[PDB]
Amino acid sequence: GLPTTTLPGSGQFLTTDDRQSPSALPNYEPTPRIHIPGKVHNLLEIIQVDTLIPMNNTH
Amino acid sequence: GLPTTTLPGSGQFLTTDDRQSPSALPNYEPTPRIHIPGKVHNLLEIIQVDTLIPMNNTHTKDEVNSYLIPLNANRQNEQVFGTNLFIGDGVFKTTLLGEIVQYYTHWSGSLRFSLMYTGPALSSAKLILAYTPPGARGPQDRREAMLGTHVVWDIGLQSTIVMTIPWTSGVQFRYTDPDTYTSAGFLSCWYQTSLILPPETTGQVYLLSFISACPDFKLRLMKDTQTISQTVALTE
Amino acid sequence: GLPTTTLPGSGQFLTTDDRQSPSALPNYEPTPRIHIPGKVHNLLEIIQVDTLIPMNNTH
Amino acid sequence: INYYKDAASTSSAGQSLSMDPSKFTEPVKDLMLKGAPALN
Amino acid sequence: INYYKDAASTSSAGQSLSMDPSKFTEPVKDLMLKGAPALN
Amino acid sequence: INYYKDAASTSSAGQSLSMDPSKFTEPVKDLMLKGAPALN
Amino acid sequence: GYSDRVQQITLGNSTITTQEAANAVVCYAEWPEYLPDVDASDVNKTSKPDTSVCRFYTLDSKTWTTGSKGWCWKLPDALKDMGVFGQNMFFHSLGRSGYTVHVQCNATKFHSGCLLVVVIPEHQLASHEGGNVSVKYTFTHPGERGIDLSSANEVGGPVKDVLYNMNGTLLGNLLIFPHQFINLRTNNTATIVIPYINSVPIDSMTRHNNVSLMVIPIAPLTVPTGATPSLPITVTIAPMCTEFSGIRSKSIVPQ
Amino acid sequence: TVASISSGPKHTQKVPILTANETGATMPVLPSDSIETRTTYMHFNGSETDVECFLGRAACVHVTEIQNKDATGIDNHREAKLFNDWKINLSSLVQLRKKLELFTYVRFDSEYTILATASQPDSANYSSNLVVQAMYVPPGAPNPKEWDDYTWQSASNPSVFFKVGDTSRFSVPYVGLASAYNCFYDGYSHDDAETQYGITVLNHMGGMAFRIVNEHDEHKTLVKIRVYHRAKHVEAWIPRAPRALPYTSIGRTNYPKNTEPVIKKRKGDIKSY
Amino acid sequence: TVASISSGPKHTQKVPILTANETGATMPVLPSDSIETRTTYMHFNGSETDVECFLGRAACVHVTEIQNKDATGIDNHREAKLFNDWKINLSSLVQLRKKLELFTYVRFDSEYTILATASQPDSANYSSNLVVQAMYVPPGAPNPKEWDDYTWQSASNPSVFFKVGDTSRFSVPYVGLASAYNCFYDGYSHDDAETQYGITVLNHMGGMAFRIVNEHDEHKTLVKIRVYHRAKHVEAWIPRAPRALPYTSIGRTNYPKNTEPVIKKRKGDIKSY
Amino acid sequence: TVASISSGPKHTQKVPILTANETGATMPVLPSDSIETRTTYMHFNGSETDVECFLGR
Numbered sequence A, C: 001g002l003p004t005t006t007l008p009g010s011g012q013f014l015t016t017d018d019r020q021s022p023s024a025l026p027n028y029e030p031t032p033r034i035h036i037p038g039k040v041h042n043l044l045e046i047i048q049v050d051t052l053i054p055m056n057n058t059h
Numbered sequence B: 001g002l003p004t005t006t007l008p009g010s011g012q013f014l015t016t017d018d019r020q021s022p023s024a025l026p027n028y029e030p031t032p033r034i035h036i037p038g039k040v041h042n043l044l045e046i047i048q049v050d051t052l053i054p055m056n057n058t059h060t061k062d063e064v065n066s067y068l069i070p071l072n073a074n075r076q077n078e079q080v081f082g083t084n085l086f087i088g089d090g091v092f093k094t095t096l097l098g099e100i101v102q103y104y105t106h107w108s109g110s111l112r113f114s115l116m117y118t119g120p121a122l123s124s125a126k127l128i129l130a131y132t133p134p135g136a137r138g139p140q141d142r143r144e145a146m147l148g149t150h151v152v153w154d155i156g157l158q159s160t161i162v163m164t165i166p167w168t169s170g171v172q173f174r175y176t177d178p179d180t181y182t183s184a185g186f187l188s189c190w191y192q193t194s195l196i197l198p199p200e201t202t203g204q205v206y207l208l209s210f211i212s213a214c215p216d217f218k219l220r221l222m223k224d225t226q227t228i229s230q231t232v233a234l235t236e
Numbered sequence D, E, F: 001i002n003y004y005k006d007a008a009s010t011s012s013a014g015q016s017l018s019m020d021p022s023k024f025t026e027p028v029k030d031l032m033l034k035g036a037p038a039l040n
Numbered sequence G: 001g002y003s004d005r006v007q008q009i010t011l012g013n014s015t016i017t018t019q020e021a022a023n024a025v026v027c028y029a030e031w032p033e034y035l036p037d038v039d040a041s042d043v044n045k046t047s048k049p050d051t052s053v054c055r056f057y058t059l060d061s062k063t064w065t066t067g068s069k070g071w072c073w074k075l076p077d078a079l080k081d082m083g084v085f086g087q088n089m090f091f092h093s094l095g096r097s098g099y100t101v102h103v104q105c106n107a108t109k110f111h112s113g114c115l116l117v118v119v120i121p122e123h124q125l126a127s128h129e130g131g132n133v134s135v136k137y138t139f140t141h142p143g144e145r146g147i148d149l150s151s152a153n154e155v156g157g158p159v160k161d162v163l164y165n166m167n168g169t170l171l172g173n174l175l176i177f178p179h180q181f182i183n184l185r186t187n188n189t190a191t192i193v194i195p196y197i198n199s200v201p202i203d204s205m206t207r208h209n210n211v212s213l214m215v216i217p218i219a220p221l222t223v224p225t226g227a228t229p230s231l232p233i234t235v236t237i238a239p240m241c242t243e244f245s246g247i248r249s250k251s252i253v254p255q
Numbered sequence H, I: 001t002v003a004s005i006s007s008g009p010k011h012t013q014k015v016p017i018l019t020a021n022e023t024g025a026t027m028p029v030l031p032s033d034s035i036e037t038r039t040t041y042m043h044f045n046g047s048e049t050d051v052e053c054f055l056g057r058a059a060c061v062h063v064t065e066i067q068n069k070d071a072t073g074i075d076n077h078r079e080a081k082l083f084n085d086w087k088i089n090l091s092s093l094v095q096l097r098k099k100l101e102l103f104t105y106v107r108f109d110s111e112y113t114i115l116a117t118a119s120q121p122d123s124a125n126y127s128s129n130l131v132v133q134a135m136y137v138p139p140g141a142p143n144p145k146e147w148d149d150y151t152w153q154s155a156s157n158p159s160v161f162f163k164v165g166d167t168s169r170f171s172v173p174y175v176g177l178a179s180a181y182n183c184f185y186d187g188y189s190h191d192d193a194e195t196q197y198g199i200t201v202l203n204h205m206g207g208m209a210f211r212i213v214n215e216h217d218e219h220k221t222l223v224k225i226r227v228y229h230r231a232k233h234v235e236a237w238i239p240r241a242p243r244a245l246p247y248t249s250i251g252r253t254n255y256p257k258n259t260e261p262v263i264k265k266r267k268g269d270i271k272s273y
Numbered sequence J: 001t002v003a004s005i006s007s008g009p010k011h012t013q014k015v016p017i018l019t020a021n022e023t024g025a026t027m028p029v030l031p032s033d034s035i036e037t038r039t040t041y042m043h044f045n046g047s048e049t050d051v052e053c054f055l056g057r
């Protein structure tokens, strides 16, 4: 038995933390990926495509 | 004392997790293993053995007779049997294949459907078996049936014919449990010419039919079977 | 602070488990061992010595 | 890392990755070749 | 260190650091050079 | 790994794997050979 | 000119010839063999009567008729009275054996009918009473007579319902067990070689049967016109690699 | 990395700012093509706009509720919330939904966190300590009828037991049947004249069942379950226009009638600032 | 790995699709023996169908119950559930049972999880905190008579103490007397004319005893014990036909009389789709 | 480790089964001194009978 101390924050759930978890479906094999045109990696990729501005807002 | 933090999920019991535990019987020595023929390693090993399909489901109480598909002498053009291919339900459901498929949520792969003929040796017959891939209705006459996957079977010395339902699919997995989107087709069988009995012989002859999975087959995402339930715990 | 998760069984006391514990008497020095004839290591050593059977149980 | 001394206390085993259906699908005494006639 | 056996159980992935807007911003068949006339 | 300083605090000992019943089963002064007569 | 079709099995002082076989099955792809030392527990040297016990015993014949439901024999029970095999059986504390089973049924090219011949390791039967009624000893030790699945329920006996294999499983799935069909149109015999299958290296031959052999008509017998409506079925079985151990006084068993 | 290079006066025949938008391209014009600039560096990587980051935080996807009470004489446990059940889905709540539907196909593993808290709205001596049991009931497997059916044995179906007030957490691999989940599907399950349209037919994920394991105490206890979902290992294809109108249904694109103008009207002219 | 190879038209004297099923073999026929195929790969290993995986998740194997109450004047603790006891066995509940009986002999280590929750069905000021003590009472060792006997000293018998609401977990090596556990046994314990038939005689595993260590408070507290069992290090021999009819008893194969047809009757002809 | 060695018929002047218990010894007689045995291995170490194990729970 190794001695430990727990710190403030133990047991909290922070929606933004990133840790490991047990898989509920041990050993399951996902469907293979096939190729699909159009993959997005960054939202910065798409905000460089121009779109129309409803400038004439007066309606 | 090393500082730690516990995460969400601490103390939970997940029936599917796999960790170490203390042994209650420290130092105990199990009985030696001896050799026993028959070891199974994968359920995929056993679903390749074929078993009989109660195709003739039309009875009213379970009987040996629902395994027998009858054949009539001298009929021409007509249809011997029909079934959809929901392997998790209907005729398939009690077969070993059907029975295992039901422990999983998704299946993919080819099926092997064979028919063994049992009529007198001096008789003869030519049958057509047809697989209709998803998208069309169960065929209504041989003309319709013969335009899809089919095998003309010539009854001979070689007693069985093995038809394969090759995996025809957009989506790479189908649910075992009857899904529409995910549906697999129909299987029908018709006289190609007709059964002919020798003299001094009479009546119906029967075909036995089996189902097993090709080596192609995949099953995934285990779950509980609708095939067994209970209302109170059993006792001795 | 290192992230941990506790499993089912935490806090249980199993009379048969074998782990480390803090010594209540830090630094104490036990009496030296001297030699004593007769040490037993296995119960298998002693069940090979024969003893009498009350076979005539009829009293 | 096993934390415990006994073998029963270790986690689940790891995939056989054995797989040989022939004891079940082809237990015939004289070998059958696919394509050759079943009964000669 | 992964403590678990399955890949789904690992933490979040790490930045694509891929980034190539041209499939979205310039899907034209004949290449356009900035500075050259748009329509020749 | 011992986490503690004192020897009493370590876990159970490990199997003697000593085993010698002769101090108990054959404490005779003159050695007896199985097969030879007990009393000569 | 060898065919899968003709075969000869010579075992001891007895030989079988079939001119219309359909290959032969060797359970789980293993052939009977003696008990290796590495697997041994009892320290007794065993007795291997060899050719006096490893020969072919032909049990009494059955009659397949249009109403037959199927028959069931248990091993080593069925042989409990055959020659020196049987004596050895009652006289040693433990014994072990594999078998060659040869089921015979010939007809003509006008008959139809198809039997399933299957070997089930550890076939624990069910009581027809339900609940937790047991199946008495005598009932599961029919001897050479075997059990006739078309006989009536008796008290303390097993259930004899064929669509359920005498245990709550469907007839259709018996095909997962080593088996062979006899289809009058193809076949006239079935042969299965059974290796010794148990969770212990050697066992008692009287308190535990380790396989049931089952012959079940599946496509009903259909004879040519004005033929007699029945065929006999004969079962011949030979112990192979038999070993007996722990000899003594000679067991006395119920009934 | 430079964010802007240094550039000076220009008097050319080479005009990068005149283009033809009819072509469908967005020409990569920069400040330095039309004013004189000075060098500046980016100092930034675009880390927090990665799709893994964008879809990778836990979002509340479902709130349900079950109660612990005497089931004696209840003819319909399901109906008494003696054990509710949820038709797993990821569009019931909208914050996360709008985020996912920025893409057409999406592929990811899920990490679920389940928080359970108890309420005792009417007179109790105390707060009891209840254990929740959430089961995964994929489609084809017996679905629970009473709060203590054989189903709950869950011998082949993953289930987690945790305490009310605590949280349970586990992660499920990408269970889709295809290569990606369809965020949209302009199809049917078959060519039927009346079959439903949409993805409802495709996103057949089965449901998840919750119950309290405890028998009843003298008072009643309301337990409210909140399921959170975090995408990990994200892959997204084909960006689409963001959702403008409100949502009305799980799985259809339908918007409400007599909705309100979504573009803010100017208080003034086109010319107004 | 290829799932299908490419294969084209055939006009041969070599027919792989004609066989003789009377032989007992299932000939390994493939799609490419009878249609023209294209290459495709498996992309799959069959991981989740390994028997270790199939039998390796926890299943509920037993639910019992004990209560904490004043034993004053109780003539039969066992009978007051002052301490229940369970005749260890693995066929009392059926989900896991059907799974195991797909095999004839099975060998594995067990991992037990024991969840205990408390109920206070009638008026209590509070919820007390009880410690459960589960003992392993193998056959030949004194079995408890009162809830506080010398037996509970358990000086040589493994016992675990945990709190109600919590879970206890430990793992026991394969304790079978033979090389495997018999899932079936067509024998008797001896050649007796009336001895019981089955495995009941073979699966002599002894029982496990639970009790609350706490003395009594003023109210009564019901504690319900659920034992979960997970097989680890699995080895299975000789596959058998799956169970079709319902079960009636621990350890016998017996099915109920006037049971219902287990094969679904067609709504239509043999010819129906 | 062998639990029993193989041993066959004996007709000797060397009798290991006759002893004099008055001496206080327990002579180490085995099955193979008085019946015909076959080889078998122990498959066991005597781990759980160690005194550390016996007094260690």
Ligand SMILES: Cc1cc(CCCCCCCOc2ccc(C3=N[C@@H](C)CO3)cc2)on1
Pocket (backbone or CB within 6 Å): A024, H088, H089, H090, H091, H100, H106, H110, H134, H135, H136, H158, H159, H160, H170, H172, H175, H181, H182, H183, H203, H205, H208
């Ligand atoms: C205990 C326990 C409980 C569980 C649940 C297992 C998780 C199964 C759910 C699988 C993921 O479900 C979905 C559903 C919809 C979508 C989706 N719909 C579109 C808008 C986009 O994505 C993705 C995943 O597992 N163990």
Ligand SMILES: Cc1cc(CCCCCCCOc2ccc(C3=N[C@@H](C)CO3)cc2)on1
Pocket (backbone or CB within 6 Å): B024, I088, I089, I090, I091, I100, I106, I110, I134, I135, I136, I158, I159, I160, I170, I172, I175, I181, I182, I183, I203, I205, I208
């Ligand atoms: C505290 C504490 C409590 C315990 C219990 C020890 C475990 C003993 C149980 C051993 C495993 O029991 C069985 C019973 C039956 C079967 C079985 N029956 C057949 C259907 C198949 O397997 C297998 C294991 O240990 N420490």
